[PDB]
Amino acid sequence: QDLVVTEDDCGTHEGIMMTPVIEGGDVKEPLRDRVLGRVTAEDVLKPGTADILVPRNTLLHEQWCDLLEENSVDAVKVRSVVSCDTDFGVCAHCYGRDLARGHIINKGEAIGVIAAQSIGEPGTQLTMRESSIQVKNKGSIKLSNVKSVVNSSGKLVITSRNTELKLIDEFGRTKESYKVPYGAVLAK
Amino acid sequence: KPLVGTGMERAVAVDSGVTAVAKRGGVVQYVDASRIVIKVNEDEMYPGEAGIDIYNLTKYTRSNQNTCINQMPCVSLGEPVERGDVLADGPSTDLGELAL
Amino acid sequence: RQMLRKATIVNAGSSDFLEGEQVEYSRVKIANRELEANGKVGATYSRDLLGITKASLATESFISAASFQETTRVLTEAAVAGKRDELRGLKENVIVGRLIPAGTGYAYHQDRMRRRAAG
Amino acid sequence: VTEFLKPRLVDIEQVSSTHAKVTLEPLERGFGHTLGNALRRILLSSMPGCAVTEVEIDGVLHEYSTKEGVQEDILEILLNLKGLAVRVQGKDEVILTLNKSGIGPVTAADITHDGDVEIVKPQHVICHLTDENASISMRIKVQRGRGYVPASTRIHSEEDERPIGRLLVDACYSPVERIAYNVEAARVEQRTDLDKLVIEMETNGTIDPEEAIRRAATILAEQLEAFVDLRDVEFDPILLRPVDDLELTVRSANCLKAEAIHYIGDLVQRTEVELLKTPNLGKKSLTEIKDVLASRGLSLGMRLENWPP
Amino acid sequence: SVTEFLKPRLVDIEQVSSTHAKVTLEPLERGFGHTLGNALRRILLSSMPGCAVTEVEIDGVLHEYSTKEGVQEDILEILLNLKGLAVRVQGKDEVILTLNKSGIGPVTAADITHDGDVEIVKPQHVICHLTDENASISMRIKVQRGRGYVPASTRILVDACYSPVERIAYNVEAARVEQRTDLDKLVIEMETNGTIDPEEAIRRAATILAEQLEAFVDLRDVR
Amino acid sequence: ARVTVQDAVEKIGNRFDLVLVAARRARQMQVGGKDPLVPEENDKTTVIALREIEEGLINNQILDVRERQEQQEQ
Amino acid sequence: SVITVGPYLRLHQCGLPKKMALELFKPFIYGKLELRGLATTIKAAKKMVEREEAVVWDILDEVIREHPVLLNRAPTLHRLGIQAFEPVLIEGKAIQLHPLVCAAYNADFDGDQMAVHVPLTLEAQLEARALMMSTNNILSPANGEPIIVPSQDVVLGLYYMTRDCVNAKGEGMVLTGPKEAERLYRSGLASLHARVKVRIT
Amino acid sequence: EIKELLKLGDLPTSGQIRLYDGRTGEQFERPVTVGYMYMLKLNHLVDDKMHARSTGSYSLVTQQPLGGKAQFGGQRFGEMEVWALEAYGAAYTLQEMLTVKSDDVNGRTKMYKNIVDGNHQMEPGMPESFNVLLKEIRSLGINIELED
Amino acid sequence: TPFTDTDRAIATSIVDAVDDTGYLTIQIEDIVDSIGDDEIGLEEVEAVLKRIQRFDPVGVAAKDLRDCLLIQLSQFAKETPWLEEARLIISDHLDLLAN
Amino acid sequence: MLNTCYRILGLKPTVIFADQIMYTGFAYAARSGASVGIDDMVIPEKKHEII
């Protein structure tokens, strides 16, 4: 309840990296609504070298997300509430709009009670409580730093416990992770 | 009364004790808005008594819920009445059927 | 963010040789002591999160967090330690019966705070 | 208009005592439905009739009691009197009496018959008796109205004239209570194909079908006459007595005359500080005037919004 | 009391244009709003005197699947534009009209020959689209007298929009006089194609219905 | 009645300063000594002040200027 | 009072019974009566209000006009459990609620009751008009999707009116668009007619 | 058997029937289902539900309006309702509900007087329940007061 | 009711000096002494008292019985008869009626 | 439809649009008849063979 917008800008570049949630069969939530109402940091960079897509502090109102999707960017560094370094409360440049308004949040609004009231309102919950790999479409391996070792057959052995795959069809967008143990044998 | 029922309304109305059922009755002598007297025939009669059964109905008494409890006679003069036949209709009862 | 407060320290840093200090207060003290006078004495801190029922009761104002869960323990601790409230929160201003420092009363609260600096 | 060939009332039929079937002359296309719907709505809405309004009976006091010798309760008696259908001649607000003794059914037939009251169904039932020594005697008041009027509506008109034992009932006043129509193309075989509408009304015997249709048509015409000519594109303060009888001691009258003070209100809506701007009258005189004004208006207390001439 | 009915006196009308008007009535009796409004709407939607164009004989093939040969616009759209033409003729059952026009392109109602009784409310109406060259065209249009409307599927070629109205609708709201709020308030909003004021059209419909029902009262209200 | 407040919101900017400004203007109109700069239409002082703000005649600067001028004219 | 449906209403409106009013607004009634000179003294004003005269009803209708009143469903879980409306006096005993705001309130029109609270200060009235008004709560503050959406008896009506069936009455008709209503209402075509060509601007 | 029984009374076995609108006289398409259902009236009447209040009798302690129609009582604003007002940002309405409409004894009369005079202004003051709480805390061996 | 500050203080004192029966206990000069102001006068106190005499309980705060019945007689409309007679008896024949 | 109206036009047009949508839907739902009956829900004839 103590949280109130008191500052306009905290002057910090810290934030969380936001990516689509790609686990299991396919993506459950794209980089479309997880970043729609946020203000990104300066880390936004075009896929091409020495090219930019948008300045540091911009509010992705309606079309910057479209441009971001067209450029096929998966990871965007966005300043958030936790990154805000304001002494009391939070600043207004790391919260976006997420209201009945189409504009950035005004100072003095009670984020603390606007939140925690939309989290507990959905009381429609319940009570009383390595071999099968299927790909969705064309993709690559994307071993993601897997230690390759000599195998008996025409393949590579795995010794690291932290293995993660990814499928790439036409751009940086992925399809699934499919974490596997160290006993996996590369078939392709 | 309900045009669509299940047949249990008669039993509920009779067993609720909210009506005035006739015990050992043969024929009705005098009917009123608040009194019913039945001349019991000699078959169901034992010596030592006049032979008159009298029922005093309950007219407009408050309930626990501040509602109205009213009993209304059904029979007329000179109407033969058997044993176990209703004579009055309590609250929400129509000729011995539960009618709410 | 509300969960991630109350950071303990392992190094003294000339702040306090105790445990259970708020992150904002510690950061303010560090920014006012290091850059201004002595940048050598830095106080390293460890961010230890708390549950909802625990971080709710670990607030600077005893007027709040006394109505939340338990009044006897909070009142005894406040009486022993001799604390003050200063009425910084929505619950405190609501209980006292003044304008909350949020919404249309935010301007009034800001004006009162600015005037209290001079007197 | 090109020869509208407008309809005529022909072939009125009387199926039964409370059921009739009226017909109208063939009429142009797209007029049967509008005419029929308007007539049916008006007939169901506003058709004057007669109904029982209030019943007094010597034996009982209120309607939640019984009577010795009578089978039904007073509520049943009143609900049986409610449906009693009776038509009345020129004057309204008639009162008729019913006295009977015996043990047989008491019908509407055995009611004191007047020259301006006609019972249309004398086989009605008025909650027959059972005891030989019982005798019912009540006075029935019959008026005429236009629409349903509950008992609560006619309460404000009776404050002092409400003796114990004068029981009022709800009034319906409506003798139609059901009507249907149907439009068919016939009876105009000589001319082009037009429509005739037949009205099937089911009254309670109080009203004449031709009279009812004519009344509905007159009502509709009177209502429509306001659309033919389209055009058009009290409250005051109670205290308005003059400035007289205000006990003008020495110079208060002179000050009021010189200041062009109005009768009462403008003097009331004044403050003491603004009144001191007037030519000097003295503190004692001001207090005396304040006392005289206060004894009737609570120390010059009023702020009026407007002032009529 | 016994036979007294409330008569509407507040008949204020506010008009946005010369063809749009919003009428309003003061509290009527209960339920008379729907009666009067529906009767008026049906009567002035299905039976109203007026003049309209009915069929057209364009030089060419009578079938609808014709060609452009310079018009650039389809004959179905030509007939659709013709339907939206408000002609008004004085006491003539049927008349014939025609037009002849150069090739600048803007074809307006003034191109039709001017007759003694045939008049056009607005002569900027577009009948034919912008032509491509100096080629001309003959319309040979004709009008009749009628009431209401009949489609061209049964009564022949384009349509017969005799009724001189565009859109009629009514809403019924609550109102009170002193204490009873169970009184109605008719609100009428009508659009006219032209040549007739909306208030005049409402008055004509009211007079039609009054003279229609007066035969049923059998000369009532003598004095 | 005035269905929505959006013109005044755009004119003022904060969505919470509008309430304060309109309140301190409706106070003048209600307590008296002031006349509505916009033609009233049998409206209450709240709506009159809100509509005057929407038209672009009243803000937290014009009101202060007028108050200071009136105080100095004493 | 118990909640009742009023479909004639608009978004910024509610139906407040006259019996409930003239009791919540009684000090305002006294003030207006004193200002208009209909009651020179508070006792006279009290007696006139107790007798419920036509002047009292007119004054109530006058004072209640531009004055928002806010309703509250008993379990209020999120922000939109309290919204401010414009009271419209109805002859009855039940508050008339708007079907569109029923979804936000979570009301169901079977015995649900609703509380009424009056703002009296100017700041409170301006606040109820500019922050809590039901015409300002379009979007949800939780996710962002609109909170007003036709849900029942309106979805069915629109679905029925916008549907296609072949060989309906008047298949080949071509018209201008204003004429579709004239064609459905009088005679000639059904609202389900296909292949109908209308020029849309 | 229901369909057979409908045939004995000369009724459509489908159960539907064509209906007409009473206000326009135009037939409904998609014939409607009519019948006879047994409807019953429950013990929740609106006569016993409505309650309204402007100013009545308060309690001797805490000086607040009584309660649930217990001799013309008032209605209860709650924690969830104040959360709603704070989320809206309704500082003035919140203060009004807290003080003027409640145990602020010296402020209730002033607000009533200003309303009758036509001023619509608030003098907030301090609630009585907070004074009661201070006295109850001081009744224990705990010093508590307000500084300046 | 619209009094000044001084009138309000006088009215508060007067209503404080009021019994359950409705007749004031102390006399008017005692009230003037209780106020203890040189400016305050008997006429001013009489004006304020007569202003509050017309309050909801008619004839309240009357000095004695003589000026309690008279207020209600004057309040009643002149249409009812025997009013002048009743006023004449109640004016200065109080003992004459008491014995 | 409502979301696009709000996004493109604004607040006043979308409020008016919501009101008019409610009015027209309420009117035409009643004008449609739209009843329910026993024969309305049909049981497949293959149900017995599947069972």
Side-chain angles (χ1 to χ4, degrees), chain A residues 1 3 6 81-82 89 108, chain C residues 1-2 90-91 101-103 106:
Chain A
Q1 86 167 20
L3 203 84
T6 70
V81 184
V82 282
Chain C
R1 166 181 213 276
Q2 291 296 145
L90 305 188
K91 270 193 174 188
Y106 180 75

Side-chain angles (χ1 to χ4, degrees), chain G residues 1-2 17 19-20 23-24 26-28 30-31 72 74 76 79-80 82-83 93 113 115 117-125 127 131-132 137 160 185, chain H residues 26 29-30 46-47 49-54 72 75 77 80-81 84-85 87-93 96-97 101 111-112 115-116 119-122:
Chain G
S1 190
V2 189
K19 264 266 311 178
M20 231 160 75
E23 172 75 69
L24 284 87
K26 189 173 292 184
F28 304 86
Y30 293 169
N72 160 64
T76 172
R79 194 171 77 170
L80 290 92
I82 301 187
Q83 309 182 24
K93 276 224 207 192
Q113 312 183 17
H117 299 280
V118 173
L120 318 90
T121 63
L122 280 183
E123 297 96 37
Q125 303 174 15
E127 276 205 38
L131 299 105
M132 279 183 276
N137 304 14
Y160 181 82
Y185 262 114
Chain H
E26 321 204 1
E29 53 268 1
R30 304 267 281 93
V46 83
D47 300 320
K49 260 51 182 300
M50 154 176 323
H51 178 49
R53 170 209 169 102
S54 53
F72 204 68
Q75 294 190 6
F77 216 79
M80 317 217 211
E81 282 96 29
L85 279 190
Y88 273 117
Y92 284 94
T93 312
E96 202 186 350
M97 304 251 174
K101 290 151 160 209
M111 185 86 220
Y112 194 100
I115 290 179
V116 160
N119 186 22
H120 298 4
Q121 197 154 30
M122 171 182 29

